[model samples]
Target: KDLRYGGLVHDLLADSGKATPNSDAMEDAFGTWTYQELLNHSQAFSAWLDGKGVARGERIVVQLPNIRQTVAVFYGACRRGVVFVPLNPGMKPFHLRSVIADADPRLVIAEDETAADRLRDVTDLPVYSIDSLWADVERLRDAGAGAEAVEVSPEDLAVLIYTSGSTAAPKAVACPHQQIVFAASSINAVLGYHAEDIVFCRMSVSWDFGLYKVLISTLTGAKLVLADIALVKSLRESGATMMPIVPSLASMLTTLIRRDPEGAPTLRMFTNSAAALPQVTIDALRSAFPGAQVVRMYGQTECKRISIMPPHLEHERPDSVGLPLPGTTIEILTLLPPGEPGEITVTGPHVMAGYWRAPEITARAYMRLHTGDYGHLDEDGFLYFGG
Candidate 1:
């Protein structure tokens, strides 16, 4: 699919920066950042990358939690043609040892001194705490730091999103700029996000589910609010219009609403993925908000997302996971026809470039992603999970 507007992810945000320069781009417990501030800081981070001897295609391990700087680092690295590798802060030394060894990143950024010490115990690589570097970012931004513009192609690797498993070895799915940008655009087409939308997010940016929220926020010029507690309360105070949720969070939300029925936010929608939401949870959300749209979805980190149940069309097929994302195709293996259960295969620009540094595994999954999960497609093309 030809990108409606193309270049790099930063270019996509440049348009947003132009359209809504003064609008609140992101929020946290500390404060908010306007679009102009975010973009300017992103440029500062890019120049800072150059000073650190990191070149294009090199990797940087970012272990910071959900924060404005996390988003800034991504776009900053995108501008410098470097790849971002986000690691969950909770990863202990055992996994961190292998992940650091696998990616061979030039730099590692931890949440603070304690997290930095943990990473230092595992790897000899340079590790800087976000607190330690906070002043530098601001100083660079104030100095009007400028990086010589680099030509970042659409196919250049942007993010090496690693699958964080407690017991299993980590594997990174290579995501390029065009694929990431296109995926966000296609999803926004379906969700209809706009400049006025305020997205409340509780999940960590290490996962693709939460990571893409930042991209979509930039794409639609919407605001993103990061919360670490009282999610429903945060939604009300921030006036968050949309939220991304999993089944557990959905059930938890229902429980919260049941306990305290008032002060509910007037949300426009709830986009769910990573697992199926129980009907009871969905029903509870509808009863509580009355006007919020509850969307069910099926996805994996390999492709970002596969299907999204259309907004407000929940009853059409309660068990189905809507249609393939815009410009993507779904295939059932074993020559099975529609309504027959088979391994799900996907092909599209949205499908990731494949795992990092593992050619055999990448080759096996490239083009036709033989998703190991079992599912069937309806005659009308909606997908269903068999397991």
Candidate 2:
């Protein structure tokens, strides 16, 4: 595939060439977006964002729900060379303020009325609702607003995903264009995706897992079913083929399957990386999706995805976290014992540049990420975690 365009916008344009008006690209319980509709709306929305005077390389905080509008905002920002910064909808006002100050974005796009209220209280930046954007985009499209030609380098920053803040205060993780492109390619190869496969996006878009949930499916021309956490059961019942879920949600699915002997069985593949999935939980998932593939990954917001276990090798080594992704390198530092835990160190293109503004913090955390993760590599080259 000789790509004429190189960023998120390029992926969308490529999708437009392959998808038709009636082709099902995205779906939920109520609605669906055809390939044509997704392209046109994204273009119009990009024009609308440009009209707002958000310059290239500027950031835009996106606080949206799992809807088509959110998808539009993603591509729209990409089309204008603006980095899309995603934050949890329930993030505290102080946290939001801090993010706003650090990112210094030109605009903030919110999901609904409640988000508008929360954002209004936090910052004076121009906030626009998805619903309003949809209407505005349509109006702009009717007024002859078309796609704008934009150039984005692979080394340019694309998104700034914040850390989960489990160990400490959250830090903004800068993701350049090439890292995301690498992730998309590596994930596709590991999963063996096709245009016919239906992907169920169960990860929250605020997290890197969730963002990949959409990016992977969209770039491959596969159907994606976006489901809210509250609507997990309904989504499974609707026959989603490929499901990307967190460990907690995977556990919930197991409980659901155990409760009902005959239940939704369309889930043939599952992927997760936020937290480690226990062996017991992995067994439960295996029983539910008997013929399905399970992939376990390890990564942080700074680096997109470092290592992943494919579906085939998952059974042989349930505890192993697989090898470094194709374009990455990993090494163990301060080895504890042969089979004991040690700090996992990594150096690769996927690693972020550094922290947003805190140089000292960046020097500490970004020195060698493997030191932060306690893990070991087996003689067979498979990586495993230690307490």
Candidate 3:
């Protein structure tokens, strides 16, 4: 099956059918879903959204933990060409209000009524409980099976992921369908994702790292085990082969595995990003999961992903972030020597369109995407971060 397509949802829907109908597609606290069942549920949710008058290019803000309903909402929004803006469920009311004011979404989906009520106080936008939404989907599914498809171009916006606000106020990064698909493909090219792979994602959907895991798994016809912070325990039960995490999660997992080495499930690979992993943590990970390959990566919310360290070089250059991802280029501002460091810059198709709704800020931030951090490329074209 061809994974490439004009839009993110286009290929996903097609692959959902092409994949083995009885094969597990997703699993969460709710239950497990086969490929066909997952598609049916997503389509039903899309129909419910259509009944609510959601149209193409509209924004739908979602705030929920890692759950099957979150996945359903994501696919349903894609089917309708609606832009997805997922927020951390743990976000403070003040920060959440700022996002609501800027995005101006048509609807806000919260985990429960309590959250919905709180959100209602901040904006006039309609708020709905995810539980109620799923109940509606159940009724709609039982009544009939029909979904309206909304055509969308590759350049159309698909998601708005807000940054962590480490340097300044948080800014929403606007990503189009093409960039999303390309970034997933580029990451898979290096990681070699296959149909047999079961990818485990524990991060929130609000982050680019967590969201792209869904796209990557679906595009590659791999099953995804969706869980929240309790993902370490699910690893043995879900039989997940590919695990993606950040430095902090890696540290936690290392501690867990150290407490009971026998609890560590045999993983095929472990991919890390968001922040660089310390050499000590990387060493601990390799020892804990002896069979799994550790893939250290470097990326930002603005561009999805920039580079990944080759598994073969994990020990050779544990300090470097390896080469640029497939079809990406990295250049230093000062044209430094092999070991000398300067501001890191990236140029690639996967680079985000820009920050959402802030033209001045976008213009200043993306002057060839000066990546704010300092790094240098070695003689072998590998990138090494400097503090």
Best by TM-score: 1
Candidate 1 root-mean-square deviation in Å: 1.7
Candidate 3 local lDDT, 1-387, one digit each (tens): 132434565457557645677777788877888877777787788888788998889899999988877877888787778889999887788788888778778899998999999998878899999888788898887776445556777888889998845345657999888888888888888888777999888878788878888888777778888772444567877888999978888888888776664555658888988777888888888888888998988988777888898776666776788788887788887566676789988887788889989899888769267789897888899988873
Worst 10 residues of 2 by lDDT: 1-10
For model 1, the run of ten residues with the poorest summed lDDT? 1-10
Among these predictions, the greatest lDDT belongs to: 1
Better of 1 and 2 by lDDT: 1
List model 2 lDDT by residue over 216-319, tens digit each: 77776777777723444664566677888779988888877766666557777888787888888888888776867788887776677778887778777777
Candidate 2 TM-score versus the reference: 0.90
Tens-place lDDT per residue, model 1, 212-313, is: 899899888999987624766777878989999998988888877776666465687999998878888889999888778998888888888888888968
lDDT of 3 at 240: 83
Ranking of all candidate structures by their lDDT, best first:
1, 3, 2
Q: Please estimate how well model 3 matches the true structure, expressed as its whole-model Cα lDDT.
A: 0.81
Query: In candidate 3, how many Å is residue 68 off?
Result: 0.9
Q: What range of 10 consecutive residues in model 3 has the weakest lDDT sum?
A: 1-10
lDDT of 2 at 212: 78
lDDT of 1: 0.85
